[model samples]
Target: GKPLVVVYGDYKCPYCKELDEKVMPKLRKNYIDNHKVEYQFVNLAFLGKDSIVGSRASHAVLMYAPKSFLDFQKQLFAAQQDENKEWLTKELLDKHIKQLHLDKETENKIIKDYKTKDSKSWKAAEKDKKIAKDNHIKTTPTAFINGEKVEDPYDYESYEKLLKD
Candidate 1:
C-alpha cells in the first residue's frame, strides 16, 4: 500500500505558509505525482475566527472543485494576512474561489456553500479541527506519515527517507 501522508495546516500560521511555500511543492512532485504516496491536506483551524473562515472556504473548494483545491490552497497561503487581523472574509473567499475559474455553477455552488453557515463544507472544516484536537496536535504544518507523526516535517530529506520505504 502507498504511504498515507496527512498534512495539517492553518492559514493564519506563518510556519504553515513557510512549509507550503517551500516543502509542499517538493513533496507533491516527488511523492504525490509519482504515486508513491497518498496525500491528504487537512485544515486545522485553531488560530482564530479568520482561520475557521479560511478553513471553511478551503473545504468548499475541496468539496466542489476537487481538481482546483490545490490551486486554491496555494492562493490562500499566498494571501494569508496577519493572524490578529480580521482578514479572511466572505468577499475575499469568493474572490479567490472565482479565480479558480471553475464552471459558473460549480463556482456558484462553492461560494454558496461557503457563505451558508454550518454548510457541509463548514462542517467538514470543523471535523478536521475536532480530529486534530482529539489527536493532541497543537501546531500547524504538522505531518503524519502512515499514521505516525513526522518529527521533522519541514525537512524535505526526512520525507525522502521515509517515503523511500
Candidate 2:
C-alpha cells in the first residue's frame, strides 16, 4: 500500500549517527508504527575494519533476535566514536548483544555468527555490501524511497511529504 524506504548507512559514520538519532525516531512513529510505509536498513560497511565488524554483528542480531535489533542499533550508535577509532570490536559487540537479555542459545549463536567470517549473517551483510557497490553509493547515509534517491535524508519534513505522496 506504500513505498519501501531503504537506507544505506555505515556504523562508523558520524552523519549516519546524527540522522539515526535525529530523524529515525520520528519516522518510526509516523510511518513504521502505523504501517504506512515499509523501512529497510542496509549496512554498507564502508568506513573501515570496525565498520565491517559492526555491520556483521548487527546482521547477526537481525537473524536471531529481530525484536532486539533496533535496541542494539540504538546502543551502538549512542556509543559511536570518531571514525578509525578503536571503538567497535567483537568483544564490545558481544557485550552489547548479551545485554539484550536474549536466551543463552540465541546469544551464543549471534556471537558465533558475528565472529566467523562468511557465516550466514555475515554473508547477508556481504550481500548488502555488494548491493551498495552495484548502486555506486559513495556516502554513509544514502536513502531511497520508492526507487527515488532522497534529496535530503536529514529532513524529517521531507520524509513526511514523501510518505504522504
Candidate 3:
C-alpha cells in the first residue's frame, strides 16, 4: 500500500511535539493502527542554530536504535521544555542516552566512530535537508498526505479529513 502521510519536523519544535504526542496518537488509532495507512517522519531541522544539536543527537539515536528513536525524540522535547535549552553537546547527549537505558559505551563508540563507518546516516540527513530546501519547506511540522502538502497540520479537523479521504 502507498504511504498515507509524510511528516517533516524537527525534534526541538514544540508544535512538532504536539503533533507527535497528541495528533499522531489519535491518527494512529484511527488510521495507522488499523493498517489503513503508513507514515514516515522526516526531520526538517529548519530551526537552524536551534536545531543543529538536537538533530544530530536524534540522527545518532535513530542510527543506533531505530526502535528507541521515538522515545528519544520525545525525551529531547521534554528536556527542551524543562531546561529551556535547544542544543545538546556530546556530554549532554550521553546523559540522555543513559536515561533512555541505551548502552553508554555503545553510544559513545558510535559517536567516536561516527566520522567513519556510521557517517552515512548523517550524510543522508544532510541530503534530506537539501531536498527539503529544494522543495521550499521552510518550517518544522510540515507534512504531506499522499504526496500532497498539508499546509496546516495543527488543525485536527483538517488533518483528519485529509487522512480519511
* Most accurate candidate by TM-score: 1
Residues 1-165, candidate 3: write the lDDT tens digits.
645777787766778887777666566667765667776667776665546555656666777876666677667666655224645555766677667786777677546533343375556556667767777877778778887877678665666777665
> In model 1, which runs have C-alpha deviations exceeding 4 angstroms?
none
Q: Cα deviation in Å at residue 41, candidate 2?
A: 1.7
> Model 2, poorest ten-residue lDDT window?
156-165
Choose 2 or 3, whichever is better by TM-score.
2
* Residues 1-165, model 2: lDDT tens digits: 688988889888899888888778888778865778887788888788788888889999988998787778878899888887968898888889989999999999999988897899889888988988898888779788887877789877777777776
What local lDDT score does residue 160 receive in model 2, on the 0 to 100 scale? 77
Instruction: Determine which window of 10 residues in candidate 3 has minimal summed lDDT.
Output: 109-118
RMSD of each: 1.5, 1.6, 3.6
TM-score of each: 0.92, 0.91, 0.72
What global local distance difference test value does model 3 have? 0.66
Q: After superposition, how far is residue 164 of candidate 1 from its true place, in Å?
A: 0.9
